[PDB]
Amino acid sequence: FRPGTVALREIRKYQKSTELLIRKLPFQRLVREIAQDFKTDLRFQSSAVAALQEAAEAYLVGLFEDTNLCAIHAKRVTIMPKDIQLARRIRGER
Amino acid sequence: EIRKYQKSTELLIRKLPFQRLVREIAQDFKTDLRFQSSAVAALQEAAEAYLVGLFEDTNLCAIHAKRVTIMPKDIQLARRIRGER
Amino acid sequence: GGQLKSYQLKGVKWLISLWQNGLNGILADQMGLGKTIQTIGFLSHLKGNGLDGPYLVIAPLSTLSNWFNEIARFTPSINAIIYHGDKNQRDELRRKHMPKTVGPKFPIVITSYEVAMNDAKRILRHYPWKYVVIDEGHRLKNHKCKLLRELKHLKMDNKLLLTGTPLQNNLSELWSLLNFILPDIQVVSKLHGILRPFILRRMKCDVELSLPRKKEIIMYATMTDHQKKFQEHLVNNTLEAHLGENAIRGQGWKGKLNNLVIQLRKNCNHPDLLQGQIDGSYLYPPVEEIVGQCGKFRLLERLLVRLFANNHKVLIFSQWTKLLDIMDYYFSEKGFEVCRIDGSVKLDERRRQIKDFSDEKSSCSIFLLSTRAGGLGINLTAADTCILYDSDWNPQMDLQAMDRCHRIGQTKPVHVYRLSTAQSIETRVLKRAYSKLKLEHVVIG
Amino acid sequence: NIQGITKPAIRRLARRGGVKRISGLIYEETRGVLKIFLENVIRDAVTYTEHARRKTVTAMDVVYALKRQGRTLYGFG
Amino acid sequence: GAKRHRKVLRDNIQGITKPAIRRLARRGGVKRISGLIYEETRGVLKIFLENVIRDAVTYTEHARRKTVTAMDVVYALKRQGRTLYGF
Amino acid sequence: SVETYKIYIFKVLKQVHPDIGISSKAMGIMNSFINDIFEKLASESSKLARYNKKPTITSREIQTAVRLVLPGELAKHAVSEGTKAVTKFTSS
Amino acid sequence: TYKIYIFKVLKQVHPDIGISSKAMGIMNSFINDIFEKLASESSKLARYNKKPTITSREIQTAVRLVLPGELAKHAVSEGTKAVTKFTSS
Amino acid sequence: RSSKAGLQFPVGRIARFLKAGKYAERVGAGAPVYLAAVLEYLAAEVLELAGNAARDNKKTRIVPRHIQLAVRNDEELSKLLGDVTIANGGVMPNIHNLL
Amino acid sequence: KAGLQFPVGRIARFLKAGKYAERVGAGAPVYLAAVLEYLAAEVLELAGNAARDNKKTRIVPRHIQLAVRNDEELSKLLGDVTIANGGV
DNA sequence: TCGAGAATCCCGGTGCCGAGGCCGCTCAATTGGTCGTAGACAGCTCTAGCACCGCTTAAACGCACGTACGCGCTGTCCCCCGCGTTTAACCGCCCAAGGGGATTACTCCCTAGTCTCCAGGCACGTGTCAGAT
DNA sequence: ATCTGACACGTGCCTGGAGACTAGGGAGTAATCCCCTTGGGCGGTTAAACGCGGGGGACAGCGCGTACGTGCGTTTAAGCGGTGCTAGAGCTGTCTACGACCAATTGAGCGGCCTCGGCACCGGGATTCTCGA
């Protein structure tokens, strides 16, 4: 096809689905690694990591919608890092 | 003029206009109401602070689009990311 | 007479007698001349009297190839199909045979434990199966295994189990199987009353000649002072600090729980395993003499120098793959040429390595080889000596290894060197594996 | 009484924030965003007041409302 | 089979593959994505997670326990403004 | 062993939409939404008690807490549903 | 209220400075607000977890869950030292 | 008591919770009734909107995807669940004219 | 009482009042006093230091604001404070 | 233009598994006297909020004028996307002997709230002495 | 240099502190048992890595014109000061009518057990949406 038409295909299917992205095993490795710092020797139930993953995905999707708004404000379509840096500054996140 | 008001701690709106607006917008919720002369002061301090922040984020939003002239699009992009009506 | 030959026929007779009683049994002939040849015998004996009916045979994959090849024996009358793979099976699903009609046409169904388990639906529809035959009974030694749950959905009017090692771990595996073979099912004699009717274990008495008799000898080693220090710091919860002084790439991966039996076994194998995992130290112990801080390593080295005095090729086994790796590092520094096949290496890659190791010309004596490796048919009879650098909770595994070199084609007499360390969990494990061999040895009675 | 928030004042506030050059349609927008804010805080204040059987918006009513909305206000009471 | 080289492992963070960031972005409505975006998303994920896990590990210890349950995570999120229904 | 409003959330549904099912994993959200709205209101009304220095959470308080949590027109139609009920309970 | 103590803390840290009247107000407000936050947090952590008492442990978790960052890591040390001195003596 | 009023939610169970939740020393008699009548109203609204949603997708049962959608659609119920993240609920479609 | 400047007794009383819970331990009053004291000390230090820059011998609302704004921790605890009679 | 083809969209038919169903039983919600206490409310004092006047002067307003910035248009070249092919990526199911778990139900103790007396801090009153408006 | 905040000593009143009980929650222990441990096996298969064009896209430069800032002379109307008036905030004292509590009573709703219809799945057939020339 012509670049950009299969991309609008993907922004429709995924907005309609409710199936989670991110493989389950890598996220669970990451959380554990991040945890060996606050307290050494700690175990995690499965439901906990599930919840954490759900929340994270939502956070990132929201950030991604506001970083698209910011980019459009500058008369572009490509979202660049400066848009991540502008959006977070307006929302207060560290 | 940027430098001057960045060193001062004085009030920037006049007094009585702020009083009347606050009395009217209350009228819609309750008729015949009184207001301690300290309440209208708190309400002014807070409002003035709020507007300064909005303006500081709108300036950021304009520097993004490579301008220096704030415009109404900017206030709106700021009040949307920040999650407001 | 008039069919096959000795070391069999009576086995088919037992199977036909079972058919008469309709009871389901578990042939367990010693792993010798039988299996595939005997398996087809009974069904082949159905021949004209009964070549019509649902027939199913589940087995691993190599075993599936083998059964298929063998079915090319005398009387190639009954048909057969290797229902293997997925989607390609879909095309042969209906093409191979009709859903219900079974004339002489019906080809024997030969599937795998995955296929059987994953898509039992397809085969669930078929009629009460005349005889489902499961090659390796040990697969079902757990009564909560998902294969067992999916294996009950099949409507089976008869069952059969092939094995050579009925019990390995304890009696509960006998219990779970007995539910499978017979749902209905001093004291030693009382057990022999229940089991005499079904079990038919013909020893290597019928097929003798097991090559020169093997020698299995345990040569202990004395835990050195660097390992004792590690062990005490690990007796409690101190190993981390005594080793956390540098804290490079994290202070002992900031965390250490584990189970004493295996964190202290890892020590008794080689302390580097702990040191590497604790401090980053991206560089292996380069002194190449700190590898000699392990007592068990030093006893291996001297053994090997005395066994190069003759050059007869050795075999090395281990439980993990980090430890074989340390060994390889050590020897490769000195310069020895090594070949290695663990589970990480690929299949066709490992098959050529053997074809080279087995090269009559090639002389890479040192061959690293994991224990649970699936390479039974490796058949490297070129090697003559096996060194079990570790123990194994289930003794049968070790025995399989013994077979991997003690098989046909080994003219030279074989030794076995089960290394170990005194005053530690290695000696504990040896006692456990010994009592498991004894559990099976009184059963052999 | 919202035209009493006159053009020079908005400009002064804007130079506190950092703005440099104001446009010409920025004023009406400012006058709207002030009104919304003032309308929320005052509603909450009048609620709190009535709850105390009074007729006088008073000390700690406004402060409490402003807190309620993420804006702690120290002093003023 | 190496000398000083032992057996190295990648960063658990590099586990979030570029394909997965793209899929999360397209669900947010983005069209063309840049190349300096991926190394930026990773940091903002890390920060979020670090604030939540810290609260969960606190709420746990107070119960004398050593396992982070789902209820500890739900409370951390509620302290941060995000409320999760369904656990 | 686990108290829940599932029984009552399915009675209101029937009353509003006669012929529509609810499914499990969907009343696992509706129960949570009720528990949370209860908590908020009660806590507000306690703070509103401790503040007004009274030891009793009465109806007046619950009402001023509703007016401050439930946002917008919901309030009005909730307040009504609720007051209606208190007068009704009174003439029993 | 806390005037004397805030006047005392100042004399100790900056021996020669004074403080106006509006400043004292801000300071007292700050102290009271921190107090209330800390205590509310501690209470909630007790209704749930099923306990009728607010022991020290809850004063510490509360300090960790609300004081942001290293600012807390110190406050915890400062509180532990003072409860230890009081208990031993 | 639930019966004396027209409420369908349980008055007694709410009263008990309020009295046993250390919410205050003495709860009155009307407070349990008012709370029940507000909680019932809110639930009815949400459920009524969610139900209108399903029929559209041509299904006769509600799933978390429906409640999310309903909440996102209406303004007041959104100002209320301004941060809530329903599990397995997806997002509401939104592609700008930049196409 | 024994160790600090703040009024361990009064803090305890305030905990008894307000009905924060049924029972209050013995250490609970002692710990809170110390934390509040530390927090006040930090703020009073930066402000005076702020006043040591402006050279003003008297701490005024402006200094407190400036100090809170600068330091990275207090700016986080004190997220949106609007000190009365202060400025940016 | 118009087709050529590829993504999109029905009909059945499938099972086929969770959405409704029922049912004793336990405990939790009613209903009745007490049993005080917490509530309303009636009345009085006096603070402070509102209305209005007159005058000064500072901030707001209107209009003219110049020019800096915003916006459209153009051209170059970097780098992102789509596709096909080859590697990893995950995910499933299994070892086996261990512990770690965490939950419940077991049992007494020292400290909470409770009194009760009695001390001396702090809120408020008052005189001095400066320092930044 | 002064007027505005300091800054200092006292009356007393209001707190804290101390001493004790009967109480009574929490620290201690035992138990059972069940999800949770480090290292490996083998077989699936779908997602992820890589490479290569080529079409976008983002970015820089230039030019016109219009809307913004500055300046100066009118004209508002805010700020201050002072006077008068009364609504209503704040507090006190009486006495009851909402509450807690206990006990007797028992039907509503709750854990585990039924079943069957709508919903996930499609394969086959059918229909519209790019695109290229």
User: If 0-12 CB within 10 Å is exposed, 13-18 middle and 19+ buried, where does residue C212 land?
Assistant: exposed
Any CB–CB contact under 8 A between A71 and chain B? Answer: no
Q: Residue C13 in contact with residue C22, Cβ under 8 Å?
A: no
Its CATH architecture, for the domain D2-68, is: Orthogonal Bundle (1.10)
Q: Quick one: C48 exposed, middle or buried, by C-beta within 10 A (0-12, 13-18, 19+)?
A: exposed
Fold of E12-78: Histone, subunit A (1.10.20)
Which two three-digit tokens encode residue B67? Answer: 């301008």
Report the number of distinct structural domains present in chain A. Answer: 1
Give the single-character DSSP code of I81: -
C394-431 burial code (b ≥16 CB/10 A, e <16): ebbbbbbbbebbbbeebeeebbbbbbbbeebbbeebbe
Give the count of beta carbons closer than 10 Å to the beta carbon of residue E62.
16
Q: Give the DSSP per-residue string, C47-75.
A: GGGG--S-EEEE--SHHHHHHHHHTSSS-
CB contact under 8 A, H87 and A54: yes
- Annotated binding residue at C31? yes
Using beta carbons and an 8 Å cutoff, which residues of I are at the interface with D? 61, 79-85, 88
Indicate whether I2 belongs to any domain: no
* Angle formed by the axes of helices A46-73 and B72-81, nearest 10°: 180
CATH of domain C10-195: 3.40.50.10810
Q: What is the DSSP string of C374-398?
A: S-GGG--TT--EEEE-S--SSHHHH
Return the domain boundaries, chain C: 10-195, 215-444
C284-317 residues labelled b (16+ CB within 10 A) or e (exposed): bbeeeeebebbbbbebbbebbeebeeeebbbbbb
B21 within some domain: yes
F64 vs H: CB within 8 A: no
How far is Cα F59 from Cα F44, in angstroms, rounded to an integer? 13
Q: Name chain D contacts of F48, Cβ cutoff 8 Å.
A: 51
CA-nearest of C297, C382, C381 to C331 is C297
- Structural determination approach: cryo-EM
Rounded to a whole number, what is the distance in angstroms from the first to the last CA of chain D?
28
The verdict on residue I38 lying in a domain is yes
Residue extents of the structural domains in chain D:
2-68
- For the CA atoms of C140, C144, C147, C148, the dihedral, rounded to the nearest 10 degrees, stands at 70
Burial class (CB in 10 A: 0-12, 13-18, 19+), C122: middle
Fold of C215-444: Rossmann fold (3.40.50)
> In sequence order, which residues have a C-beta less than 8 Å from that of residue C56 and are 6 or more positions away?
C109, C111, C123, C129, C131, C132, C133, C154
Q: Among all residues of chain A, which has the CA nearest to that of B84? A: A91
The H or E element containing residue D1 is: none
CA F74 – CA C36 distance, rounded (Å): 78
DSSP designation for C200: B
Element spanning G19, H or E: strand G18-19
* A37-41, long-range: CB < 8 A, 24+ apart: A37/C254, A38/E53, A38/E54, A38/E57, A39/E57, A39/E61, A40/C254, A40/C255, A40/C256, A41/C255, A41/C256, A41/C257, A41/E66
Which residues in chain A touch residue C257, judged by CB atoms under 8 angstroms apart? 41
Which tokens go with C124? Answer: 């669930």
> By the 8 A CB rule, do C239 and C208 touch?
no
Q: At C274, is the secondary structure helix, strand, or coil?
A: helix
**Count of domains in chain I?**
1
Where would I find the H helices in chain D?
Answer: 7-17, 26-51, 61-68
C11 assigned binding-site residue: no
Q: How many residues does chain B have?
A: 85
User: Which residues, in sequence order, are CB contacts of B49 under 8 Å at separation 6+?
Assistant: I82
The Cα C262–Cα C405 span in angstroms is: 28
Chain K positions with a protein C-beta closer than 7 Å: 5-7, 15-17, 25-27, 35-45, 47-49, 54-59, 67-69, 78-79, 87-90, 98-100, 109-111, 118-120, 130-132
Which domain CATH number covers A86? 1.10.20.10
Contacts of G56 in chain I (CB under 8 A): 25, 27-28, 30-31
The whole-angstrom separation of Cα C195 and Cα C181 is: 11
Q: What phi, psi does F71 have (nearest 5°)?
A: -95, 125
Hey, are the CB atoms on C333 and E5 less than 8 Å from each other?
no
Local structure of C360: helix, strand or coil: coil
Length of chain C: 445
Neighbouring-strand partners of residue C110: C57, C82
Q: Do chains E and B touch (3 or more CB pairs under 8 A)?
A: no
Q: Does C34 belong to an annotated binding site?
A: yes
Bridge partners, C219 (sequence order): C419
Strand, helix or coil for residue G54 = strand
Q: Exposed, middle or buried: residue F41 (CB in 10 Å: 0-12, 13-18, 19+)?
A: buried
- Annotate A39-92 with DSSP letters as a single string: SSS-EE-HHHHHHHHHHHHHHHHHHHHHHHHHHHHTT-SSB-HHHHHHHHHHHT
Q: Closest residue of C to A42, CA-based? A: C255
Residues in chain A: 94
F54 CA: distance to closest CA in chain H (Å): 9
**Structural domains of chain F, with CATH:** 6-90 (1.10.20.10)
- Using the CA of F20, which nucleotide's C1' is the nearest one? J19
D76 CA to K58 C1' in angstroms comes to 52
Tell me, yes or no, whether H27 lies in a domain. yes
Q: For residues C291 and C284, give the distance between their C-alpha atoms in angstroms, rounded to a whole number.
A: 9
CA–CA min distance E11, chain H (Å): 29
Instruction: List Cβ neighbours of G57 (8 Å cut-off, separation of 6 or more).
Output: E62
Amino acid at E74: V
I3 domain-assigned: no
Say if strands C108-111 and C55-58 run parallel, antiparallel, or are unpaired: parallel
Q: Which domain holds residue I20?
A: 8-77
Domain that holds residue A58: 5-91
Q: Is residue B7 part of a domain?
A: no
- Distance (Å, whole) CA G73 – CA I36: 14
Within a domain: I86: no
CB contact under 8 A, I84 and G26: yes
Determine, yes or no, domain membership for I52: yes
* CA distances in angstroms from A41 to C237, C254, C256, E67, listed in the order given: 12, 8, 6, 10
Assigned token pair, C245: 């002084």
User: Is there a binding annotation on residue C33?
Assistant: yes
SS (H, E, C) I32-63: HHHHHHHHHHHHHHHHHHHHHHHCCCEECHHH
Instruction: Spell out the SS3 assignment of C106-128.
Output: CCEEEECHHHHHHCHHHHHCCCC
User: Which site among F2, F4, F8 would you substitute to test the H interface, given the most H Cβ atoms closer than 10 Å to its Cβ?
Assistant: F8
**Does residue H2 sit within a domain?**
no
Return chain H residues 38..57 having CB < 7 Å to nucleic acid strand K: none
CATH code, H41: 1.10.20.10
F contact residues 51-80, partner E, Cβ 8 Å cutoff: none
D62 contacts chain B (CB < 8 A): yes
**What residues contact A85, with CB distance under 8 A and at least 6 apart?**
none
Which chain I residue shows the shortest CA-CA distance from G6?
A: I40
Give me the residue from G39, G60, G69 closest to I15, CB to CB.
G39
Cα angle, residue I13 at apex, residues I10 and I15 outer, rounded to 5°: 115
Which nucleotide has the least CA–C1' distance to C139?
Answer: J94
